[PDB]
Design a protein around this ligand. Structure first.
Ligand SMILES: *[C@@H]1O[C@H](CO)[C@@H](O)[C@H](O)[C@H]1NC(C)=O
Ligand SMILES: *[C@@H]1O[C@H](CO)[C@@H](O)[C@H](O)[C@H]1NC(C)=O
Length: 273
């Protein structure tokens, strides 16, 4: 309250020091995480602050994330996309499904970090696969359920009228079933995928049970930090050094308060309206 206690101005530009900034450009953090074909340049990157642009768009299989805001926050705070492949035992199914809705280098493809499993010899066995976490750090697994447009497609892919998936650890259990039906066509696709996530602590075991419709993980992400973050801004990133980042640009950390934006990253004045 009073102009000498409150910072109110900005240059419209975010400084690239002192924090490590990653410009999402045309990719959302979630598309970089799943491995959309336009986002392969983000693999394994780290950040203090991820800057997400309003013109970001998707170019792979159409999907939703029931828990979108939480998964986005978790990965943003973590500050890394470091990914480690694991070899799951997918005996009895066909692996590596691809789609014309997801083109990579001019061929049908799919999210790089997910594995679209389908029937083998007209049988989709009841999969029961495990992956112990014998590491000293937490693992994050991203997986999904495919919702076909029609019963014909469901049968063609899975040789099963309705899949059931349960993914569990000693600490949690999630069970999902496809919702078959035709939705508006995105890149000519009336079907969808819904994305889910599961953390496995050291000493715990990932258990995956599926009878159909599983979009499987190929491995795990690490959880690196709890102090990175994400912000939506269209400000350019320039070569300068400034302590407090806001969507409206970086500002110095000088007065007790600021009314530039309630969203900030770094050592900053407190927001006051
Ligand atoms: C993969 O899983 C099946 C269980 O249905 C088993 O028969 C097979 O031996 C497993 N492979 C390995 C290498 O454990
Ligand atoms: C599936 O793709 C993975 C990685 O792209 C590859 O290593 C593997 O050989 C493929 N498996 C099959 C059964 O096609």
């Amino acid at each position: 309250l009073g102009s000498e206690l409150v910072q109110s101005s900005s240059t419209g530009e975010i400084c690239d020091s002192p924090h490590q900034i990653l410009d999402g450009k045309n990719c959302t953090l979630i598309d970089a995480l799943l491995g959309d074909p336009q986002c392969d340049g983000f693999q394994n990157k780290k950040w203090d602050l991820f800057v997400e642009r309003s013109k970001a768009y998707s170019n792979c299989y159409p999907y939703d994330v029931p828990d979108y805001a939480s998964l986005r926050s978790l990965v943003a705070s973590s500050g890394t996309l470091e990914f480690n492949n694991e070899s799951f035992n997918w005996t009895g199914v066909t692996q590596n499904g691809t789609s014309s809705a997801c083109i990579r280098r001019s061929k049908n493809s799919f999210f790089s970090r997910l594995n679209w499993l389908t029937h083998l010899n007209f049988k989709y066995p009841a999969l029961n696969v495990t992956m112990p976490n014998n590491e000293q750090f937490d693992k994050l697994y991203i997986w999904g359920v495919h919702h076909p447009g029609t019963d014909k497609d469901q049968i063609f892919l899975y040789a099963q009228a309705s899949g059931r998936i349960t993914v569990s650890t000693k600490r949690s259990q999630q069970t999902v079933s496809p919702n078959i039906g035709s939705r508006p066509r995105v890149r000519n696709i009336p079907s969808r995928i819904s994305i889910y996530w599961t953390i496995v602590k050291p000493g715990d075991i990932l258990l995956i049970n599926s009878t159909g419709n599983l979009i499987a993980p190929r491995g795990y992400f690490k959880i690196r930090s709890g102090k990175s973050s994400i912000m939506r801004s269209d400000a350019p990133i320039g070569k300068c050094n400034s302590e407090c980042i806001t969507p409206n640009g970086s500002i110095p950390n000088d007065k007790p308060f600021q009314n530039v934006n309630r969203i900030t990253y770094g050592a900053c004045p407190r927001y006051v309206k």
